[PDB]
Amino acid sequence: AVQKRVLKSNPSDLEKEIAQCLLDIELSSSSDIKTDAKEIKLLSCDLIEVEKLKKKTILIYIPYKIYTTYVRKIQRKLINELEKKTKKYVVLVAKRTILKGKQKNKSFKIIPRSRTLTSVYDSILEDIVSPSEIIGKRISMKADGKRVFKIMLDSKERQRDNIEEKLISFAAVYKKITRRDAVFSLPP
RNA sequence: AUUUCAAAGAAUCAUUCUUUUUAAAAUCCGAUUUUGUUACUUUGAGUAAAUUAGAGUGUUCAAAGCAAACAGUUAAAGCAU
Numbered sequence A: 001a002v003q004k005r006v007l008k009s010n011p012s013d014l015e016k017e018i019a020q021c022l023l024d025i026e027l028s029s030s031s032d033i034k035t036d037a038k039e040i041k042l043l044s045c046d047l048i049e050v051e052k053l054k055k056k057t058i059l060i061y062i063p064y065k066i067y068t069t070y071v072r073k074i075q076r077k078l079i080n081e082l083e084k085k086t087k088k089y090v091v092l093v094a095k096r097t098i099l100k101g102k103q104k105n106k107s108f109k110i111i112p113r114s115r116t117l118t119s120v121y122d123s124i125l126e127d128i129v130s131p132s133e134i135i136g137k138r139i140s141m142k143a144d145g146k147r148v149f150k151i152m153l154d155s156k157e158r159q160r161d162n163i164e165e166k167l168i169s170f171a172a173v174y175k176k177i178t179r180r181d182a183v184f185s186l187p188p
Numbered sequence B: 001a002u003u004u005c006a007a008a009g010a011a012u013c014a015u016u017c018u019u020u021u022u023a024a025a026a027u028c029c030g031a032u033u034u035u036g037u038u039a040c041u042u043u044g045a046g047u048a049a050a051u052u053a054g055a056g057u058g059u060u061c062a063a064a065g066c067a068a069a070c071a072g073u074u075a076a077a078g079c080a081u
Helices: A002-006 A013-028 A064-069 A071-085 A117-129 A163-177
Strands: A044-048 A057-063 A089-095 A134-141 A147-153 A181-185
Touching: A002 A013, A013 A044, A013 A057, A013 A071, A044 A163, A057 A064, A057 A163, A064 A071, A064 A089, A071 A089, A089 A117, A089 A163, A117 A134, A117 A147, A117 A163, A163 A181
Parallel strands: A057 A089, A147 A181
Antiparallel strands: A044 A057, A134 A147
């Protein structure tokens, strides 16, 4: 049936809710979205809380090819439709594969840099911030010996009123995906 | 310049030392175990003694030596059948 059309693999509650919501978005076609969301198909979902214990965040995993072709083009409008439908913060990421440098794959003349840890984690940082684009990066080394990622955002999405909530949400999601402590902010 | 960052636990005085897990492929019965070359570095192996450093040992002491020690005015003791 219509769930298995867009849902990648045998499922639990939240994967089905997102898939149904996407089909609902596909069906109605009255918003300022072109060819709707029709080719988007979802790999997986996670639900995560932040520092504050309410208005949780949903991570959405997408197959790289799909993300690159379809999702990226319409991203601001699409994410807003998801926010409207499910009363939660949604964040979209592309599944990139990561390979250790000497480990040795059947394909490839040595490991491609696109498959390196550092490049992929930089790429995911672009994915999570995506309604904005990164202004500059700064890694602070505290006396503790931990490292803090001060990630500075542009200025476009400073006007919409979900700002602080989004920044905390991004920090949380970056931490669950990649084991680091980030903080996010915007210039004066 | 650049290609794998980290996270959790126990010991100990408040630091230190130690263990766990965290990508991907092949392989072995949803679980189990392999993955550039070389320098470098770690352990090791196999190394003549004398010499030399060095442990043991009151050559009268020392330089030395490679020995010695013990009980017994003459037997006890041990263990051998």
